Every structure is written in C-alpha cells, then in structure tokens.
Amino acid sequence: RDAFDTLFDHAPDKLNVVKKTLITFVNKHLNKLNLEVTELETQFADGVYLVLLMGLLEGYFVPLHSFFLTPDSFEQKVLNVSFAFELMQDGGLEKPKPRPEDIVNCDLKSTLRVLYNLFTKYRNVE
C-alpha cells in the first residue's frame, strides 16, 4: 500500500492534480515527436508512447525493429510495455511495481505509478 492506494481510497478528488501534471510532463517530451496525450487512462496501454518516452528521456533513438509500433494483439502490447520497463531499468530505475499486463489492461493506478516515477527521475530533462 503506497501513496497511490492512499490517493484513490482517501483523497480521490485530488486525482485531477496528478493527471494534469503528468500529462504536461509527458507532452513536454512527446510533443517533440509530434505526439500527444489527452488521456492517461487509455493512451499508454499499447506500450508505444512509453517506449518512445524512454528514448526521449534517456536521449537515444529507439530502433523500430526493437518493438511494435502498430501492435495488433494483447501480447504485442505486453512486449512493448516489458520493453519500456527494461529501458527504465537500463536508466537506473528499479523494477516497476505493476506487471506489463496491468498497463495493457488500463489499470490507472499502475499507469500513474509508472509515469510518476519517470516524472521524479527525469524532472530536469529539457
């Protein structure tokens, strides 16, 4: 039980503050590739934006053969998320708490945790 469990159980009227702030953050970087997020609930589930964001935050071009740009199955989406998690750990982050499947399943708490830990680590990336 972390602060995200406390947030959803005890202060759920503050979720909008978290959402907005993480949206601004992801868009600051994703906008460099002409990409945009309006909705954290759905738009990270296929793993594509999460992979590209790692390239953006650690400062490398992610080769397209290393993932699924247009995932057509649940398993291909899982593999994208697993690959972004791998790149997070390559950057020094500890193993994400959620399963890759939780992200594909649009679990919002899981999506918030992943994005917040990027937010905290990469706060200073211009």
Partner: peptide, 13 residues
C-alpha cells in the same frame, strides 16, 4: 502544477 503534485504525494505518504 509541479510543486502541487510533489506536495500532495508527500502528504499522502
């Protein structure tokens, strides 16, 4: 925006 998220997360911890 940014500070408010940090403050919130800290107070929930």
């Amino acid at each position: 925006a940014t500070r408010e998220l940090d403050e919130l997360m800290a107070s929930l911890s």
